[PDB]
From Swiss-Prot:
Phosphorylated by GSK3B; this promotes proteasomal degradation. Transmembrane segments: none annotated. The keyword 4Fe-4S does not apply. This is DNA damage-inducible transcript 4 protein. Its main location: mitochondrion. Belongs to the DDIT4 family. GO terms for cellular component: cytoplasm; cytosol; mitochondrion. It comes from Homo sapiens.
Length: 128
């Protein structure tokens, strides 16, 4: 499942690069190189005790922003299988990186990226 997971990490970063956390305004969220590695490792660890391994997983991603927890997206890891377990990935964005843009920001220069924390959680639950 290692190549499946590597590819998933790529899809995840593409997703986070245009994340919407509570509004329509996308934010360019970046995963530290270490986070990508640790996340992948843990997803794999949790999946190997399941039928079909990581292929049977439904990945559920959210980003912690202070007290809030924003849903980023959800993905069945293999289109030809019905997911039988859910992996909830909880990432974190330091709240100083968090403001309101205004209605007249067109001539503003492109937003900078925001790098996510190295801390995260993964929770697995069987689906029925």
């Amino acid at each position: 499942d290692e190549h499946l997971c590597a590819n998933l990490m790529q899809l995840l970063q593409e997703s986070l690069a245009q994340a919407r956390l509570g509004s329509r305004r996308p934010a360019r969220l970046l995963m530290p190189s270490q986070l990508v590695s640790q996340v992948g490792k843990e997803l794999l660890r949790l999946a190997y005790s399941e039928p079909c391994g990581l292929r049977g997983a439904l990945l559920d991603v959210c980003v912690e922003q202070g007290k809030s927890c924003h849903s980023v997206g959800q993905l069945a890891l293999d289109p030809s299988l019905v997911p039988t377990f859910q992996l909830t990935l909880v990432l974190r964005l330091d709240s100083r990186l968090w403001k309101i843009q205004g209605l007249f920001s067109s001539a503003n220069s492109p937003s900078q990226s925001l790098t996510l924390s190295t801390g995260f959680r993964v929770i697995k639950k069987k689906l029925y």
